[PDB]
Design a protein around this nucleic acid. Sequence first.
RNA 1: AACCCAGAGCUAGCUGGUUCUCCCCGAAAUGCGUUGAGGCGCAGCAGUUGACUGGACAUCUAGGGGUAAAGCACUGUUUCG
RNA 2: GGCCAGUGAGACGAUGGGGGAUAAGCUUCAUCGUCGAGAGGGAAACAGCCCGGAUCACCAGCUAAGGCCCCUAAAUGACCGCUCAGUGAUAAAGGAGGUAGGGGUGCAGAGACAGCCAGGAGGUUUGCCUAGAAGCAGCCACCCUUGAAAGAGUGCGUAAUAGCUCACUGAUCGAGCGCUCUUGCGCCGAAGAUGAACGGGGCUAAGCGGUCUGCCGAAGCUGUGGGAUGUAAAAAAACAU
RNA 3: UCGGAGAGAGGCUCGGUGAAAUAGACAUGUCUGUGAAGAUGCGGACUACCUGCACCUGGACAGAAAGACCCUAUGAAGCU
RNA 4: UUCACAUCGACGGGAAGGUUUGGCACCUCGAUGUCGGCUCUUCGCCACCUGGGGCUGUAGUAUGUUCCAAGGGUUGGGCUGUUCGCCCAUUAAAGCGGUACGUGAGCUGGGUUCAGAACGUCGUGAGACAGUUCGGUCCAUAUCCGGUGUGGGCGUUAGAG
RNA 5: CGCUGGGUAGCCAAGUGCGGAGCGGAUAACUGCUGAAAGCAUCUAAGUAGUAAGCCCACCCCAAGAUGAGUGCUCUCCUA
Lengths: 221, 37, 100, 47
Amino acid sequence: SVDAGIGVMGTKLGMMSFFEEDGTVVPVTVIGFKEGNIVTQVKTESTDGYNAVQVGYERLRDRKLTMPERGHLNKAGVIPMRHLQEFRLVSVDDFTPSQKLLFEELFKEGDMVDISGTTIGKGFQGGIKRHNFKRGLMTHGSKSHRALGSIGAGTTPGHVYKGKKMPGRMGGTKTKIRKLKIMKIDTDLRVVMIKGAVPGKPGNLLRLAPAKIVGKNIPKN
Amino acid sequence: MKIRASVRPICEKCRLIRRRGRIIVICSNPKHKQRQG
Amino acid sequence: MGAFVIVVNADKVAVSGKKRTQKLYRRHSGRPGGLKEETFDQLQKRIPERIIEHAVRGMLPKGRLGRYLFNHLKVYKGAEHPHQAQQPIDLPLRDKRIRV
Amino acid sequence: SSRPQKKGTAHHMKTRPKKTARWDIKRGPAVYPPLPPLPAEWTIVSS
RNA sequence: AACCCAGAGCUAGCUGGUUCUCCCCGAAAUGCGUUGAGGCGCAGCAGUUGACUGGACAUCUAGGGGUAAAGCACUGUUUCG
RNA sequence: GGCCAGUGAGACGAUGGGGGAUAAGCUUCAUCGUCGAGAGGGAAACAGCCCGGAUCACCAGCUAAGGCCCCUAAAUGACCGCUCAGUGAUAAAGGAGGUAGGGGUGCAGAGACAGCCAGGAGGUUUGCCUAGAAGCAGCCACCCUUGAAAGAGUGCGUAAUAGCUCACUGAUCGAGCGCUCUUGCGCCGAAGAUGAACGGGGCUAAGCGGUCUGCCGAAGCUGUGGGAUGUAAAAAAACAU
RNA sequence: UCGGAGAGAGGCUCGGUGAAAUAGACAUGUCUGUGAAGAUGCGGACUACCUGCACCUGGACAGAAAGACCCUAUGAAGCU
RNA sequence: UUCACAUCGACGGGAAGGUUUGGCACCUCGAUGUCGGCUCUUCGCCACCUGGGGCUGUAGUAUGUUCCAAGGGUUGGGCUGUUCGCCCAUUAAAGCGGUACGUGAGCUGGGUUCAGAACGUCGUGAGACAGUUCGGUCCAUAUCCGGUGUGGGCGUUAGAG
RNA sequence: CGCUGGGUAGCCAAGUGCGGAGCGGAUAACUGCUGAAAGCAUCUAAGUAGUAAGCCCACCCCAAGAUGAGUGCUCUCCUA
Ligand SMILES: [Mg+2]
Ligand SMILES: [Mg+2]
Ligand SMILES: [Mg+2]
Ligand SMILES: [Mg+2]
Ligand SMILES: [Mg+2]
Ligand SMILES: [Mg+2]
Ligand SMILES: [Mg+2]
Ligand SMILES: [Mg+2]
Ligand SMILES: [Mg+2]
Ligand SMILES: [Mg+2]
Ligand SMILES: [Mg+2]
Ligand SMILES: [Mg+2]
Ligand SMILES: [Mg+2]
Ligand SMILES: [Mg+2]
Ligand SMILES: [Mg+2]
Ligand SMILES: [Mg+2]
Ligand SMILES: [Mg+2]
Ligand SMILES: [Mg+2]
Ligand SMILES: [Mg+2]
Ligand SMILES: [Mg+2]
Ligand SMILES: [Mg+2]
Ligand SMILES: [Mg+2]
Ligand SMILES: [Mg+2]
Ligand SMILES: [Mg+2]
Ligand SMILES: [Mg+2]
Ligand SMILES: [Mg+2]
Ligand SMILES: [Mg+2]
Ligand SMILES: [Mg+2]
Ligand SMILES: [Mg+2]
Ligand SMILES: [Mg+2]
Ligand SMILES: [Mg+2]
Ligand SMILES: [Mg+2]
Ligand SMILES: [Mg+2]
Ligand SMILES: [Mg+2]
Ligand SMILES: [Mg+2]
Ligand SMILES: [Mg+2]
Ligand SMILES: [Mg+2]
Ligand SMILES: [Mg+2]
Ligand SMILES: [Mg+2]
Ligand SMILES: [Mg+2]
Ligand SMILES: [Mg+2]
Ligand SMILES: [Mg+2]
Ligand SMILES: [Mg+2]
Ligand SMILES: [Mg+2]
Ligand SMILES: [Mg+2]
Ligand SMILES: [Mg+2]
Ligand SMILES: [Mg+2]
Ligand SMILES: [Mg+2]
Ligand SMILES: [Mg+2]
Ligand SMILES: [Mg+2]
Ligand SMILES: [Mg+2]
Ligand SMILES: [Mg+2]
Ligand SMILES: [Mg+2]
Ligand SMILES: [Mg+2]
Ligand SMILES: [Mg+2]
Ligand SMILES: [Mg+2]
Ligand SMILES: [Mg+2]
Ligand SMILES: [Mg+2]
Ligand SMILES: [Mg+2]
Ligand SMILES: [Mg+2]
Ligand SMILES: [Mg+2]
Ligand SMILES: [Mg+2]
Ligand SMILES: [Mg+2]
Ligand SMILES: [Mg+2]
Ligand SMILES: [Mg+2]
Ligand SMILES: [Zn+2]
């Protein structure tokens, strides 16, 4: 999809509170930043048919990388890095490789931001937790307590409908939390404070970019 | 406008005109305008 | 034993009557609400090429070979194609009702 | 509601192919002249 | 209205089953009667054999009816003046 | 006549009727056809409808019903007309300046049709109804005068006044105009439950009607060559099956 | 209401031992039609790489008991 | 109020639909398990609310009737075995129906269709009542299709991240 | 867990945040503009404009087994 602006990647560190001057409480989530936030590749319409830019993160030892990945980073004279993600845009006229991306230059204060990361993996869960189905009676002779019940009508149609809400794996996928307010910046510790929750546990990767709104930022269709 | 299957003029000023494959009545009185089907 | 065919200027295809707003290209997913109707003109803007492909497919045989015959058809929106090295020729048209 | 459906064998009587055309029913095979008397197909030589 | 053995391979107008080949001909689901109605008997229709016949198809003519249609002269019904 | 079987649940369709609701793929009789016991071809698939009754073989040919844009065999054939609704698959009353015609009828160079301008009175205000209305709540009645044209006045509006406005005539303007039936093809009426569902793809002829000439098309017919049955009693040849 | 957490025995994995009902052959999709009137098996269109594992049962007019309801038999039996 | 058609519309007429009670008795008797409820769906519109309009005997607010529109929504309780239906308090409104009157190899068994017993009634009687009453066993390890998830193999024209 | 009183992480809701945007596109019903056939009139059988919780895109996730199997960067293919 098309992003409204350019974002970065950070790691969840934990969660805490934030007391305002008047005294109001704000449940705030903390996000740290590793060393690498440098641009790796710049894509254009002449070559790839779309405009975007890669971004790497989480520097690591060079021995751990596969040798193809080295040549991709060594082209732009860039340090070794683990992760890579893109940021699709309308114009990439002001970006080059070997370019750092400071978040304080992009997210000053009180700016809405779209967080996205991997959720907690619940595993093979049932219907009551996954699809919020209701439960049967626990007494009065009922045999079915947490079962689904019926999964179809009968001879007509004569088969189970596709996409029937049924058990399976839950969580562990990608999500996006929209319009979260930034509370405070701290360049001394290289950390950022955002109101609200964030998907995943501490140490998880995520991407934060400027909040995209339908009619305001992105091109309508 | 009131709709029916049998549309015809009610008074003298009612005119019958076809628009978009539909027989329609048009008059100065807002009551007397009609539409078939 | 047949041959290849290339189509160009697919978006300039003619259509008689009011089929430009009445002919409904449609498809289905499998759900009880997966029916997606689409007109000629709406499909003419989104993907012009399915118009030619959907028509010829109904005329080709149905089976192993017909699925193999479809790839022999090449269709393009613009007035040019990259298949210059093959040295194609202009196709004849016995019918006289095709040119408006 | 009070009109039956004509579902059984009557569906055949109503829907079977018909011509209903004097110009098409009156037709027949094409007539050509007869060929000359042809020779036989085989003939034995003394052997 | 116990169990075993025997009469007893009881009976079952009811189900099910009934094994190689080729050739020729070829049905009926109708009527009467039945403590009968998803059974049986007779007729009708098959096959096979024998005897006696000359018709069948087509065409024309003759003969008696009381249907369609038509009608209100009878029997009933009915509108107006 | 002898010997000796099975059958005695019928089915849809056509016609003639009955019962039913002039409903039923309903039910019961009569006269026929087919299936039953019947393959093949057409009908998208589909015992009862249409053509036609499979002795067998052929990588031969002509045809029937029915068809000839592609899937899918045969003329993207010809000529005279109709429809623009994807009608072409599916049901009526009723509705209509739809469309292409047809047959009556009326009007017009001593001006028709529409458009714009001018007039659109008075009296026996009849009587009746009403507190009141000259025409306009309304009943009966609808005669007469002046004039080119005007009515016991069409519609609007007023309790009633008043007023607006119509028929009608005068001029302007120059070739057509109106009334009433009617045929063919179509439009609306025409709404259902898993998903185009009407063979499909698609077609403005690749639809509907008329006309001419070719072709495709069955296990039918013809041609060629075998087997068997009956005539029939040996063979053979022949006819029929 | 409105579920949630936890323990134990199974479930799941590995090794060993190792059944059963069932079963015309099965290379076993959906839709809408058709049909003994309710089709994976016929028609048309759509969808669909091959093959496993763990889970859920709508259908296969699933399995199980020659329907125990109703009717038939010039059947059987008990009772009045 | 006068005005047939704002809203009703007698008398009669012409239709569609296949959810009611029925007619026929075509599939199923070597079995197609029932009423209601729980859980879980999914479609239809002849529209209860929500969106947008027309007419009104629409001043306004609020209606009334009707068109487009099925995207979403359509409460919790008292009585009843129930459906239906009445009632309490609310709500934007508390819609009608199809899917074997959706769904029992998914659940419940209160009702109906076994054996016990009793009242009333009928019958001389054994017994009987689509009359009532108390009580009364619902099995099942998923082969295939189908469905929710997760792998492997191979392919994608050298092999890969 | 003998019975009880408390309880971190974890899981969970009753707890805590976020979400549902668009003067974007095309339409239905309706209102229209311009204006013939029919010197008038007519929303239209040329053209064109407003406008629905509906339709399409946009928003979120999956996704080239999309066999139509794509695109781009990088890497490897030794010895005799
Ligand atoms: Mg986990
Ligand atoms: Mg509950
Ligand atoms: Mg339990
Ligand atoms: Mg099925
Ligand atoms: Mg019917
Ligand atoms: Mg013929
Ligand atoms: Mg015996
Ligand atoms: Mg004895
Ligand atoms: Mg014979
Ligand atoms: Mg009989
Ligand atoms: Mg007979
Ligand atoms: Mg007797
Ligand atoms: Mg008898
Ligand atoms: Mg008998
Ligand atoms: Mg018999
Ligand atoms: Mg008997
Ligand atoms: Mg006999
Ligand atoms: Mg008579
Ligand atoms: Mg009989
Ligand atoms: Mg008679
Ligand atoms: Mg019958
Ligand atoms: Mg019968
Ligand atoms: Mg026969
Ligand atoms: Mg048919
Ligand atoms: Mg020929
Ligand atoms: Mg034809
Ligand atoms: Mg051909
Ligand atoms: Mg059509
Ligand atoms: Mg049609
Ligand atoms: Mg068709
Ligand atoms: Mg013709
Ligand atoms: Mg033969
Ligand atoms: Mg022959
Ligand atoms: Mg546990
Ligand atoms: Mg355990
Ligand atoms: Mg083991
Ligand atoms: Mg398969
Ligand atoms: Mg049928
Ligand atoms: Mg079917
Ligand atoms: Mg087959
Ligand atoms: Mg099929
Ligand atoms: Mg289970
Ligand atoms: Mg069974
Ligand atoms: Mg039995
Ligand atoms: Mg029995
Ligand atoms: Mg008897
Ligand atoms: Mg029904
Ligand atoms: Mg019924
Ligand atoms: Mg069985
Ligand atoms: Mg509606
Ligand atoms: Mg019912
Ligand atoms: Mg049910
Ligand atoms: Mg079930
Ligand atoms: Mg009970
Ligand atoms: Mg007594
Ligand atoms: Mg009790
Ligand atoms: Mg059970
Ligand atoms: Mg399995
Ligand atoms: Mg499976
Ligand atoms: Mg505690
Ligand atoms: Mg404790
Ligand atoms: Mg105008
Ligand atoms: Mg004009
Ligand atoms: Mg137009
Ligand atoms: Mg909208
Ligand atoms: Zn009027």
